[PDB]
Design a protein around this ligand. Structure first.
Ligand SMILES: Nc1nc2c(ncn2[C@@H]2O[C@H](COP(=O)(O)OP(=O)(O)OP(=O)(O)O)[C@@H](O)[C@H]2O)c(=O)[nH]1
Ligand SMILES: Nc1nc2c(ncn2[C@@H]2O[C@H](COP(=O)(O)OP(=O)(O)OP(=O)(O)O)[C@@H](O)[C@H]2O)c(=O)[nH]1
Ligand SMILES: Nc1nc2c(ncn2[C@@H]2O[C@H](COP(=O)(O)OP(=O)(O)O)[C@@H](O)[C@H]2O)c(=O)[nH]1
Ligand SMILES: Nc1nc2c(ncn2[C@@H]2O[C@H](COP(=O)(O)OP(=O)(O)O)[C@@H](O)[C@H]2O)c(=O)[nH]1
Ligand SMILES: [Mg+2]
Ligand SMILES: [Mg+2]
Lengths: 427, 431, 44, 100, 38, 431, 431
């Protein structure tokens, strides 16, 4: 019908994916064994979209889990939902990449992609009408930044037509856990722009903000940080899976979102976020949701949108609501903040509705934005990459893998040619 | 009175006779024991002093395992044990074994068995003969039985219901060889043909009846409806009755050409029957779409040269002509220049019954068509393409010569199909 | 030497009517077929 | 083995050439039950009896069907003899192959 | 759906003939309304 | 009726027959004493194909175990299914051949042949209508590859028409437990190709990867090795014993797979191969059964068909399916992998259906396909035979047995003639 | 009567010829030997042996290209001096084929055409084929017109010519030759038929569905257009149109003699099956900008004159209904001084179809010839390409070394500055 194959690479992607496959496991009413224990028919009418039919009333993921280092996959197999992912969907090498993009993309990335290209091809012909592909990784590591993008270069040659969405994890400058990150980031962003329909720039600093100030969590670990990405995961496809007043899918937003193919770097958000103290004295209504999207505080990107102009903005509402308030609020926020939108596109705001709210909640929303201020992140990778390329520092880890230096030169050339044409559109 | 002897051959013939005789028993009310819990049954069933009726069929096969499931089945006490015949070894997709080494061992037992049934019949209308071209017994032995059946009776009708090789899919590899070397001989000793491809019935069932995964019985059930409506005029009363001799007269303009193309309508599900009004206009147009044809051949690619019409159920003589009136007034349907009037309407009273466990819905009216055309001549051409590109290297033929027989029959059979294809063109041209 | 014709030879054996493999090769030894092909009017 | 093998063609050409005459004979003779026959084919048709009203009008057809089976039954007896002889030179060649 | 997946794991050895052709009810026999004799 | 006499040669052969007779005794519900403890009725309907009747409701298999070493019979007789074989059917000699093809074929096999020929004749005349025989052996041995070739070479003269099968085991170049095995290999294939009806090349090397990579057994013993071959032997005579929608037998695949008498080498396969972690995560359906059939990882032959062309293909499905999805998948793999199919034979795929699933399972199918890529197997053997034969090595073992030196030369010339015949059919123009 | 002589220049025309006369030979009914087992007189000439020599000449500067013609199937069809050949080419150097290499062969060419010209009695026009890229197809063709102009002052000389494509190019030095080429087709021609391979590439890809064609497939369409042009001459029709008439009805001013051609329908057999074709259907296809053979957008300009050449089974009543529809469309613009802008041509004989060809046999077609101001922008894209090369004096030393003054480069560019500005101001409506 319209099926998604969920790709999963790197340590980060392996974890948020297990986190992502926890929410859509919770909502669809399927127990950790593999059997459906929900209540309503609507929960199982479209489950072909993420789950594959298997004998005995049991469903299995359309998920491919890849990691060069086998250390992490034992943890995914040993979580609460570790009895759901097929072992043949696990494919692993023996040695990690050591946080080198070159190794994961050229030397040991070659021997594994044939395995990954095989199983996705098995899942390519398994369903009848695929809607697209969807991947999670990190540009700051060695495998997801590396072999994760190698698949992107390969699957785009195999299936040009299908939409490709990437929920990638962009490194933060104020908090850095890797010095060869501005290398691997420079060498993956270059690989993203030509072969990707829509990129969701996720970071970790802004997520550390959100729990601290919006949720007042005293010890926010990686697990709670993984909760919010999985929330935004289901909100993107909350319309494809269910009925509503105004349905949508991945393609309807994407064509409404990309005026020129070089601009597909986004800025995702999640609405109902308040403290554990305020679980009673806080009204769950349409306008207070809209008041929560368009702050710079709820945002899980590493940029302040007030420094740029929102090109296009999409709001996907979840749950049942009367419609008139949304067009009133989305129009209202357009009029008052008229200086923060580009004039050359009218009616900048996109609205879609599903009728079903998520589990344990009455109303939900997801906001995906293309704005100028995403340029502020890309200039400052080059602010770090130039400082490390000019002294040729840490370089010999890369030239030992057979690559040249010109790839480093042309990678900076392509990002420079991205922001330069990105800056003209703000002015 | 009317009688029909069924001479089913092979795994195709036995499994077809399984489906047909089940429908027949519900149609006249016979229990699986063989009793009724007036004499409309005499054309199919027989009589004994205790009221027990036996079918007038002969299930023949050269391998056992097809028919031992009949002998141990639900209808195990309906049939004479003598009527079902079995050989020890089969032909195994080899026309030659079933015709020149294995057939003669068993031809004399089957023929004598035929004799007693036709002794029981006083007035026999026609012999119904069902087989296939892919299998060895259905092609080889059947071609031998026709040859000696004709010398037993010069006149008696010999209808030929057939299973043809499908144009794309195949259950056999050497299957052209049996098919070409069969119609060379049965041409002399047949009176009508009803070739139907399981591919085309596959096309109909999934598209019309919403069974994405049918079985051979589902195809078998449709064939039973076809044979029901042919003989339905003999069995039950009607406005314009038709016999086997009658439709044979108005279907073949030349003895050379006796390969019609059958069609049924309506074939729709009960969910699709609840919402849809069915009228005599609606069912008669469905018999003309290529998507309802049970041979992979398009009558738009050819020209109709004879048509026979069988109405059955709740139908009225007035509305029959108006449907035919509209059918004639369309230029996508063509006719040869030497056939302005090419119709023959039969009207029957009884609506067809339903079989629970079947697929078709209960409907009050139905049509069956038998349209002889030249659009079937393209089907022979595809067979010649595959046969000639195989006979060039002369593959699989060592089985045929090594069993016995000649190699000269191989050359003579192929060119006789070139003549037959050429003959259909002389009808195709207009003066 | 120029190989042997393992298609024309088989077709000839079939046409002669030799079916068993031993007889097929005996016919080969009899009639090997090898591909030797490997190497005044004035009008105005 | 060659002459034994080359004889499989010559053996097999003869039973069908014999078998065709078996079926060709019965068609000329006709059906075994005259009630299975009874139709336009008999020699007592309405067409012929009409013609028999005038004196001296009859048929020579009932003798040409005789001469049709004359050569047909004759040819089978010559054919059966040539068949039976040809089996003896098949078994005797097969037996002598065993001793060799 | 519960029936569609519950009717899977059964020891359903049998010929398709015997699972396809059972004993029919005497109620479902044809009534034979239109017939020739009196 | 249609019986099989199970021939059995060599330590490799005697072990597989013990394992092969296990899975059929389990399926037909035969306990080790021999009685029937099954539940159904179809589980004893065609038992007589394999089992002979003995007094007290006892069945003994129609097996003849032969060997040149006395110690192998005692290990077989001391197994669980030990007292199920009639004791007289064991034929064992006092002296062994010892991996030498010559000793087993002239010197010491010539004293044992008469004793086996007494036994096999008694079992041949025991049944009224033998379908044929069947042997299992290895071509690296001394008795199975030795006297076993002498065994077949005799009884072809006694029973010409009967069907001959061999699940022969040809040595691999990558793994070998013999130094002299090409001499056993080359001098046996020439005798094999003269006198056999069809063959299946099951190489222990290929089954080693399949348990290595697909089943993921940490310790795949020879028992786990010979469980896979036993399912393959059962999966050919399957339609013979159980009723099906579209039946087959040994001959029907035989006539349909071998265009010419010299090509009877097939690469067999088995579809339901899944590891334990894959038992949970699977939806056992017809496409998932077909997708495992055609990936060259599944084959039990040591050659990749991707380097060759699929001459003919046969597939026998076991279970109760919709034969629509039987016919859709075979057609699909015909058109997608068109370059991997010869063009002078259209519709190279042959299908058949058996309703009764394998015990403890629901869906299964076995594959018998003839390719020209098995020429890769032979040329690897002749790569080593001429390597040893140029140095006249290991020859005093063979010359002292009484044979001549030219017999090595002629067997290599025949072997080179076969690979010159298959190869030309690869580079053959259809038009 | 009407007789036509062809003067194929360079590699372009000779391959253009090979498709043309192979179409012409099957148009009339000749055999490759040159005999028929008087519509041919326009194109063939009767000879002593009763053989028909085609009124054609090939002029080419390299031996291999026309050697293929002298060795092909049509070797005996043709007269050897008509295949005129040169030892050494210009190698895409307009200076060489105009000043150095042509002058060794100029007078030989003029001999052979006059000998065929003396054979004819009444001449209408010379149909010559060339390109704007190659040296021989531009430089040699340039000078021969200048002599042919003073040799035949009144005779017509059509210009079927290849325009270098806007994007895809098989050379680098094409724009220098083309800017030098235009003066010949400007002051020494009466019509022209410039076309780029790119648009012919698109229509084959978009409509003919052939994703991998060659230079034969494009050439098949070119001959079909010429076949439509001369169909009035060869065969009778309702409204026969000679070329001088086509010349009269298409050229507004002496300078502007650049028609654009268009053929409809160009449709494969599979797409022809589901699409009925009408007179109204075909005339709309000619005005779709997607099917234009030149990469210019007619909707960016307006029409000054159009020539229609309908062919096959067409009726004048449908033509006017087709014509009246085209007027009632604001998408199609006409210049204000053109109240009526059409030349309607009717023939009876349908266009043929070549075996191994691409177009399906359609009972009705149409040709099109429009003089629009759309083609103006094509030259301005050529002028820039020449401009950005000439300022830095790229490649000039090659032509200067051959012996043209450098001022001729500037003088030629002024002409296209002159030609383009005439198009723009003519397009301006004086209202
Ligand atoms: N439509 C239809 N076709 C059938 C049926 N049964 C068998 N066939 C066809 O019969 C062909 C094979 O011949 P069979 O009837 O199975 O076997 P046979 O006629 O006894 O000949 P042998 O195999 O030599 O014994 C297959 O290709 C099927 O297409 C059936 O029930 N319905
Ligand atoms: N459509 C088409 N164009 C051709 C053909 N042959 C040559 N051309 C075009 O002609 C241009 C170059 O001139 P050619 O015809 O190849 O050779 P030439 O005319 O003898 O000129 P020189 O090569 O310099 O001798 C190329 O750019 C082609 O586009 C042809 O057969 N069909
Ligand atoms: N958002 C998020 N980031 C994580 C998580 N686990 C690890 N990371 C980040 O991933 C980065 C290291 O990625 P790495 O495992 O080397 O990627 P790989 O080399 O492609 O496998 C670190 O900077 C971490 O901050 C997680 O659960 N969530
Ligand atoms: N697949 C398989 N191969 C076996 C088995 N037993 C032995 N072999 C092979 O058979 C060969 C030895 O056979 P051998 O005893 O010499 O046969 P014999 O001389 O006829 O008795 C070795 O190469 C083994 O690999 C078995 O159970 N399964
Ligand atoms: Mg059969
Ligand atoms: Mg050239």
């Amino acid at each position: 019908m319209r099926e998604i194959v969920h790709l999963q690479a790197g340590q980060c992607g392996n974890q948020i994916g297990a986190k992502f496959w926890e929410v859509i496991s919770d909502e669809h009413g399927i127990d950790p064994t593999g059997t459906y224990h929900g209540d309503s028919d609507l929960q199982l009418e479209r489950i072909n979209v993420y789950y594959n039919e298997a004998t005995g009333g049991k469903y299995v993921p359309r998920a491919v889990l890849v990691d060069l280092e086998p250390g992490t996959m034992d943890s995914v197999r040993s979580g609460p939902f570790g009895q759901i992912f097929r072992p043949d969907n696990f494919v692993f090498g023996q040695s990690g990449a050591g946080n080198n993009w070159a190794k994961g993309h050229y030397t040991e990335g070659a021997e594994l992609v044939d395995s990954v290209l095989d199983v996705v091809r098995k899942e390519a012909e398994s369903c009848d009408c695929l809607q697209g592909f969807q991947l999670t990784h990190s540009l700051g590591g060695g495998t997801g930044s590396g072999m994760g993008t190698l698949l992107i270069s390969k699957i785009r040659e195999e299936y040009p037509d299908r939409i490709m969405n990437t929920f990638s994890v962009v490194p933060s400058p104020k908090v850095s856990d890797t010095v060869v990150e501005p290398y691997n980031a420079t060498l993956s962003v270059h690989q993203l722009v030509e072969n990707t329909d829509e990129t969701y720039c996720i970071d970790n600093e802004a997520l550390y903000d959100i729990c601290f100030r919006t949720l007042k969590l005293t010890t926010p670990t990686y697990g709670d940080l993984n909760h919010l990405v999985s929330a935004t995961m289901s909100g993107v496809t909350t319309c494809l899976r269910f009925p509503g007043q105004l349905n949508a899918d991945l393609r309807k937003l994407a064509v409404n979102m990309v005026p020129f193919p070089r601009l597909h770097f986004f800025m995702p958000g999640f609405a109902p976020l308040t403290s554990r103290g305020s679980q009673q004295y806080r009204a769950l209504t349409v306008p207070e949701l809209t008041q929560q999207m368009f702050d710079a505080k709820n945002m899980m990107a590493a940029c302040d949108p007030r420094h740029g102009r929102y090109l296009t903005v999409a709001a996907v509402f979840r749950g049942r609501m009367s419609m008139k308030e949304v067009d009133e609020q989305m129009l209202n926020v357009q009029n008052k903040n008229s200086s923060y939108f580009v004039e050359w596109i009218p009616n900048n705001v996109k609205t879609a509705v599903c009728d079903i709210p998520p589990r344990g909640l009455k109303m939900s929303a997801t906001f995906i934005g293309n704005s100028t201020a995403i340029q502020e992140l890309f200039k400052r990778i080059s602010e770090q990459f130039t400082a490390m390329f000019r002294r040729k520092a840490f370089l010999h880890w890369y030239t030992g893998e057979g690559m040249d230096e010109m790839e480093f030169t042309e990678a900076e050339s392509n990002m420079n040619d991205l922001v330069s044409e990105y800056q003209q559109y703000q002015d | 009175m009317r009688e029909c002897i069924s001479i089913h051959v092979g795994q195709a013939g036995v499994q077809i006779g399984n489906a047909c005789w089940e429908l027949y028993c519900l149609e006249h009310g016979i229990q699986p024991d063989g009793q009724m819990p007036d004499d409309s049954f005499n054309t199919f069933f027989s009589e004994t002093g205790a009221g027990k009726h036996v079918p007038r069929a002969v299930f023949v096969d050269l391998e056992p395992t097809v028919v031992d499931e009949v002998r141990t089945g639900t209808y195990r006490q309906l049939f004479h044990p003598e009527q079902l015949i079995t050989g020890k070894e089969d032909a195994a997709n080899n026309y030659a074994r079933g015709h020149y080494t294995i057939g003669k061992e068993i031809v004399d037992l089957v023929l004598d068995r035929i004799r007693k049934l036709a002794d029981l019949c006083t007035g026999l209308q026609g012999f119904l003969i069902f087989h296939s071209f892919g299998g060895g017994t259905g092609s080889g032995f059947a071609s031998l039985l026709m040859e000696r059946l004709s010398v037993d009776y010069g006149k008696k009708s010999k209808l030929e219901f057939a299973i043809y090789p499908a144009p794309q899919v195949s259950t056999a590899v050497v299957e052209p060889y049996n098919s070409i070397l069969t119609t060379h001989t049965t041409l002399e000793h047949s009176d009508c043909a009803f070739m139907v491809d399981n591919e085309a019935i596959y096309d109909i069932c999934r598209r019309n009846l919403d069974i994405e995964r049918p079985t051979y019985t589902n195809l078998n059930r449709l064939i039973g409806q076809i044979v029901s409506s042919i003989t339905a005029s003999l069995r039950f009363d009607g406005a314009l009755n038709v016999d086997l001799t009658e439709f044979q007269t108005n279907l073949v303009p030349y003895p050379r050409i006796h390969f019609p193309l059958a069609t049924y309508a309506p074939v729709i599900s009960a969910e699709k029957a609840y919402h849809e009004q069915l009228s005599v206009a609606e069912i008669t147009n469905a018999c003309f779409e290529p998507a309802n044809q049970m041979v992979k051949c398009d009558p738009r690619h050819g020209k109709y040269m004879a048509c026979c019409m069988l109405y059955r159920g709740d139908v009225v003589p007035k509305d029959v002509n108006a449907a035919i009136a509209t059918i004639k007034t369309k230029r996508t349907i063509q006719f040869v220049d030497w056939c302005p009037t090419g119709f023959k309407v039969g009207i029957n009273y009884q609506p067809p019954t339903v079989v629970p466990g079947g697929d078709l819905a209960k409907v009050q009216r139905a049509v069956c068509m038998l349209s002889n055309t030249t659009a079937i001549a393209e089907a022979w051409a595809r067979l010649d393409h595959k046969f000639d590109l195989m006979y060039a290297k002369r593959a699989f033929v060592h089985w045929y010569v090594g069993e016995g027989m000649e190699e000269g029959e191989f050359s003579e059979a192929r060119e006789d199909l070139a003549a037959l294809e050429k003959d259909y063109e002389e009808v195709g041209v207009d003066s | 030497e120029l190989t042997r014709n393992y298609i024309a030879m088989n077709r000839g054996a079939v046409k002669a009517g030799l079916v068993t493999a031993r007889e097929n090769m005996l016919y080969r030894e009899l009639n090997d077929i090898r591909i030797n092909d490997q190497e005044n009017m004035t009008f105005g | 083995t060659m002459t034994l093998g080359l004889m499989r063609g010559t053996i097999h050409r003869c039973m069908k050439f014999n078998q065709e005459m078996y079926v060709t004979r019965g068609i000329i003779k006709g059906p075994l039950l005259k009630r299975n026959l009874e139709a336009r084919e008999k020699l007592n048709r309405p067409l012929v009896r009409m013609y028999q009203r005038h004196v001296g009008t009859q048929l020579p057809e009932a003798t040409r069907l005789a001469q049709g089976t004359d050569l047909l039954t004759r040819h089978n007896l010559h054919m059966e003899k040539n068949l039976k002889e040809l089996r003896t030179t098949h078994d005797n060649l097969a037996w002598g192959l065993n001793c060799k | 759906l519960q029936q569609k997946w519950l009717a899977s794991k059964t020891s359903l050895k049998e010929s398709i003939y015997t699972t396809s052709y059972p004993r029919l009810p005497v109620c479902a026999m044809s009534r034979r309304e239109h017939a020739i004799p009196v």
